Symmetry: C3
Subunit: 391 residues, 3 copies
């Protein structure tokens, strides 16, 4: 099976797994000390829950027998019939689902009931993520009409970004959100998360070629490129607006990473530069806009992932270079690919937001999403975990 290829995907799988708690640390540093444990705990729970559901039926529903091009059957439930390298694919994919759910925790920072997050995550995974994976990567209707998503610009970034937006609006602003700014308790903790995410993204985008070949090498080159450009952009904006805080820098780098994900295996270095440059700009604008509109989509999963993933997914249709991976975009003489991406982006963006909104409200009405005011006041570490982050 080419031990080399298995080697690379085994490694890439470990890398993506690390990104789950990586997300937890990244977010934890930006919340208050009284909610640090909760923010990290959520990423671990996301992992645990994801692994179980994925095995149970998640994998089957995403990549099993296709039914009307919208979803898969239960032929792979409990991994029945999954052998050899399909098992490696399953495991690798399982980690993409886990990171997505963790990113989503951005919208419930500092005020959600853990039990409720679990219920909603299980439902979201079932009714939003699995479907997307199937549409694009499981031979679903989107792949059928020619849509492409190399590493998850849509399956992962658009889904969590817009789902995060829907969730934030449903759960409401944190107490005092509007009055005074919420300061991060540990920027260094966040920076550790950021280093783990950049590092893990090597397996995320580079592993998506499913082999140790020229496409993975390209994905690795362009991934690092877009990240650097988008990070540089936020740095400049930082200076333009005052001082370049470390948060803006890494946030910019992450915008570039999310934007390049859907295209990592189709574009050249020049294309990666445009994507990163534009990503840095539009994502920063989205942040200020959601801030202007007073939406407490707390850690900007939407501005960064939602908008970054949306852009990158569209950019695939404009800059795909056939010399790179056969596929060609508008600038390389193919208008058709652009239309496929727009349809794919319009569909996944609307569905992620609208369905998440339905799910969020359903659960809210069923069990209630938000913690009580006093718990929010004392912090979820104590109230939801009966723990104290530091002594």
């Amino acid at each position: 099976m080419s031990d080399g290829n298995v080697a690379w995907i085994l490694a890439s799988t470990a890398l993506v797994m690390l990104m789950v708690p990586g997300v937890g640390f990244f977010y934890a540093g930006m919340v208050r000390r009284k909610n640090a444990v909760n923010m990290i705990a959520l990423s671990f729970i996301s992992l645990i829950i994801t692994v179980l559901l994925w095995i149970f039926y998640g994998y089957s529903v995403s990549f099993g027998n296709d039914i009307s091009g919208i979803i898969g059957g239960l032929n792979y439930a409990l991994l029945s019939g999954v052998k050899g390298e399909d098992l490696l694919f399953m495991m690798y994919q399982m980690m993409f689902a886990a990171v997505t759910i963790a990113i989503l925790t951005s919208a419930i920072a500092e005020r959600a009931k853990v039990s409720s997050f679990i219920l909603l995550s299980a439902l979201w995974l079932t009714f939003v993520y699995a479907p997307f994976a199937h549409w694009l990567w499981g031979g679903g209707w989107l792949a059928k009409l020619g849509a492409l998503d190399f590493a998850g610009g849509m399956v992962v970034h658009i889904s969590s970004g817009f789902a995060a937006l829907a969730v934030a609006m449903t759960i409401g602003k944190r107490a005092g959100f509007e009055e005074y700014s919420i300061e991060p308790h540990s920027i260094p903790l966040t920076l550790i998360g950021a280093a783990l995410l950049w590092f893990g993204w090597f397996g995320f985008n580079g592993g998506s070629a499913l082999a140790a070949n020229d496409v993975a090498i390209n994905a690795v080159v362009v991934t690092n490129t877009s990240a650097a450009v988008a990070g540089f952009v936020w740095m400049v904006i930082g200076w333009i607006k005052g001082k370049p805080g470390s948060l803006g820098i890494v946030s910019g780098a992450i915008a570039g990473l999310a934007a390049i994900t859907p295209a990592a295996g189709f574009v050249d270095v020049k294309g990666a530069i445009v994507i990163g440059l534009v990503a840095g700009i539009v994502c920063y604008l989205a942040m200020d806009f959601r801030i202007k509109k007073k939406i407490d989509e707390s850690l900007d999963a939407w501005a960064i992932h939602g908008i970054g993933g949306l852009w990158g997914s569209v950019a695939v249709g404009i800059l795909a270079n056939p010399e790179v991976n056969g596929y060609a975009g508008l600038l390389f003489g193919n208008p058709q690919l652009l239309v496929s991406q727009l349809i794919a982006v319009a569909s996944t963006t609307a569905y992620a937001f609208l369905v998440t909104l339905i799910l969020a409200k359903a659960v809210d009405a069923a069990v209630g999403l938000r913690v009580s005011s006093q718990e929010e006041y004392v912090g979820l570490d104590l109230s939801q975990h009966e723990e104290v982050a530091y002594t």
Copy 2:
């Protein structure tokens, strides 16, 4: 040599190395601020010491010429005659020894003399670890009677777990251990350790197939499975008993990882589920029991690793699936394998505990294990390292 296979083991080696300080961070967060540096420092020392002894003679004693099936000769001392991929095996194995010693530091948390830990570690490595590795993986008498241990359920988890129990009883309870509970100074630090351990375990269990093949893929699948189940279990117990603290969650995940280690390459996903489920339960019971018996085996190396490794090692004899890796357990028609595991588990459990006990007391009588009361009072960071963790 299949560059793919070398690639995977080179990577798996780096992964296991990371687990050493990973253990240090995991433990450090659960001790008091005045002992944070010491707890981490111990894991680095474990690494340094292990590497030296392993090269000097540790490797030879573990995998050299067999003498009476209990130990190896000195033909590989200073790596004399070790070439090509035997060198990669040596290096990979060296890291297993280092992690084991680090896990063991659980029993001496906050009150041991560094110099003494080194002496004892050197002796333990020599008289307990090397022998075990040889019995099971060096063509020793246990492998000879058909015993199996895929990734170290016995060589690593049972050994450190029970050795930790012996050490704790010999060194005694921390001052005030019984009166008031000792709070962790940094749960987030512990969670970083936990993420590094989960991530590193990909190389630990996945690398144990010694190749990038179907067995490693299986080991990776089942490893993640058992961890998720055992973590889910502790989460439920947490709710049943109040609130699911992040510590219980990751502690549960680690119980599943330790339990699955001896079996990662022999069982199917259904088997992994049973192992994780049972592991979560029995390990939690072991924790409460050692707590009930007032034994200051501080960070539960015993409850988690000892008991988790014991269970998993036995489970190998019940659930080994021949369709997975040829070997078959009791449930797959082979009673013989179960007997081999019981004998192996009875032997390694008794030896680890009894011999460690002899070694711990010997050193105690020779140089003294525990620091003075005042050092314990001011903290080992200052007293043993003349450092202060934070300012």
Copy 3:
């Protein structure tokens, strides 16, 4: 292309990337709380800046058409003409440049203008790093006269070490440097950095064979060996001088890692032992000496990397074992190799220091390197990033 080999280098690339922020954490823990964000931020900026310049022309200047053996042309500017595995080489090499620049941040700890660091880094990369890479690895005049540097004893360690010395002397001592000692705000943060650096060095030295073969395995064995020896040495010195602080231990391990880098693929385990032993000693002496001379080369990039890299690079000429990788040193009957190393070390040491000195003063005169006294007083987190590390 041997998927195995690509697999290993893709992984090694991710590993070296991690070492960049790893350096940031390592350094951040040793500075004051008011400068924690700045110290880490610098490592991320180093990465971002490096990636951009490397793509733009850095790579071409290092490995493009040779001009008079001192530098490369612009034929690979913007990666024009770089395809297949040359692209993987490019990306892997790009990360070596990034780590070098991060190491260098040691000399400007707590008192530099970010804008100025960027300018100087861009110039240093252009006029010092690229040239070195070309001399030794780009078919430059040094490789031509038979000089060797397996993983960068000179290209990375000597360059940053001596450049750091030049920079420190040009920027001046931190306020109060002489009066009272500057305490590290978070040793644990530093220890996390150290674990990431040790782990990442697997890709650094092990990946330098450019394939998953016997040389990489050897590099991995010897790398871990020298680190352990040098760390053990500093530990002993620590006891001899009082208590073995964790900082000395990891600092010693890093001396061994830097010393072994230029030789990782040419020496045997016995040679690795001598190198580590000597490295621990000479590097510790260099630290005390620069401390005696009152030079605020803050985090000892010079004592550790400069001197460690200098030693190891020379040691290559004494201990290269032909049985290991064909090349042979003085002790293996070849005086010639020793002369090549001395010339290479004399040249790179003098150039790094002298040219960096010119660059540092130029920029200082152009825009000014150091922040104002009051910024230094309130801390660069607030003054240069308008952020606060912890709340």
